[PDB]
Design a binder for this molecule. Structure first.
Ligand SMILES: [Mg+2]
Ligand SMILES: [Mg+2]
Ligand code: NA
Length: 326
DNA sequence: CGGCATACG
DNA sequence: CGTAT
DNA sequence: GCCG
């Protein structure tokens, strides 16, 4: 009944097993901090399965036959059902390693590998990093300076304001160019930690060279607190009552021939796209990315005019963005 | 046991 | 190495 | 950690 790939089933934003999925996602996150991508994936997938169920899991037997539930994930659920708490999960939560790796990896410019090195050097706090700024990149310096604002959720009201200012700069950079909201907000989220925009133009090729022109205009408007092509990871100045706050904004440009693939990729979720690409390659023999869908036998790319086209060419039932919350 | 998504900056 | 979904 |  429950298919094995997350792209084969609807996953709504809110569901009936929130606490169970959150516990599994703690273990997934911890596995990632230790470099165990395989364990991270299994725990992520098991969490996602529960998000897709039509009602709460109340008994252990309801896990029988669910994909990605083996001894470990099942035991986690069993303990939560019987005692409201899983000792392993709580042990991770309070560990100095988990808390510090989470704190460090949250910094824009710091990945697992950097965080881990710092952890091994004895660093534990943000002020520990500030007191040795010679070791930080310019990106990390920006992430650390803006860390407090960047930890505050972006609201859907903020998004509309940012979109209008991005369209203004885009319209001057290239008349006729369009801006599409992607990422978590396109899946229906009411809050987020960043805002993702996809930019294109209806005349193939006109979008070449566009992103530098957009960025230089935004910067001239005084809206860019930080930025470093076709992808830009920025920190924007967002107006606030009597002041402002820093917000992470990603801008991506794609040619209109590739727009369906880029929209699909950048709308996520992250797990959904990984599962979709795994499904494409392993079940259909097709290679999927955010630029296209390649048949390695015929050596041809699939033309798509819509996301609907892509789901059809992979033999999957269409899922709107709000059901891609794997 | 191999595999685990696939890019760009 | 970082970033993104 | 789990699947095929
Ligand atoms: Mg986002
Ligand atoms: Mg983003
Ligand atoms: Na980071």
């Amino acid at each position: 009944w429950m298919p094995a790939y997350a792209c084969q089933r609807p996953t709504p934003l809110t569901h009936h097993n929130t606490g169970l999925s959150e516990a599994l996602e703690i273990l997934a996150e911890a596995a990632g901090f230790e470099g165990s991508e395989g364990r991270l994936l299994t725990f992520c997938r098991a969490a996602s399965v529960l998000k897709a169920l039509p009602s709460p899991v109340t008994t252990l037997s309801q896990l029988q036959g669910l994909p990605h539930f083996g001894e470990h994930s099942s035991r986690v659920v069993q303990e939560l059902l019987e005692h409201g708490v899983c000792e392993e999960v709580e042990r991770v939560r309070r560990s100095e390693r988990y808390q510090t790796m989470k704190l460090f990896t949250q910094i824009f410019g710091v990945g697992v590998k950097t965080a881990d090195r710092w952890y091994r050097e004895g660093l534990r706090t943000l002020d520990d990093l500030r007191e040795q700024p010679q070791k930080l990149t310019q990106q990390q310096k920006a992430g650390l300076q803006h860390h407090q604002d960047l930890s505050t959720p972006v609201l859907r009201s903020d998004v509309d304001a940012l979109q209008q200012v991005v369209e203004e700069a885009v319209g001057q950079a290239l008349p006729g160019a369009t801006v599409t909201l992607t990422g978590g907000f396109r899946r229906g989220k009411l809050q987020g930690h960043d805002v993702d925009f996809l930019i294109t133009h209806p005349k193939e090729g006109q979008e070449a060279g566009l992103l530098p022109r957009v960025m230089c205009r935004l910067q001239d408007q005084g809206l860019i607190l930080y930025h470093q092509f076709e992808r830009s990871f920025c920190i924007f100045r967002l107006p606030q009552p009597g002041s402002w706050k820093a917000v992470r904004v990603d801008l991506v440009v794609a040619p209109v021939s590739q727009f369906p693939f880029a929209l699909l990729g950048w709308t996520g979720s992250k797990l959904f796209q990984r599962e979709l690409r795994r499904f494409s390659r392993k079940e259909k023999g097709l290679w999927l990315n955010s630029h296209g869908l390649f048949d390695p036998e015929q050596k041809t790319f699939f033309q798509a005019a819509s996301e609907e086209d892509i789901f059809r060419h992979l033999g999957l039932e269409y899922l709107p963005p709000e059901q891609r919350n794997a």
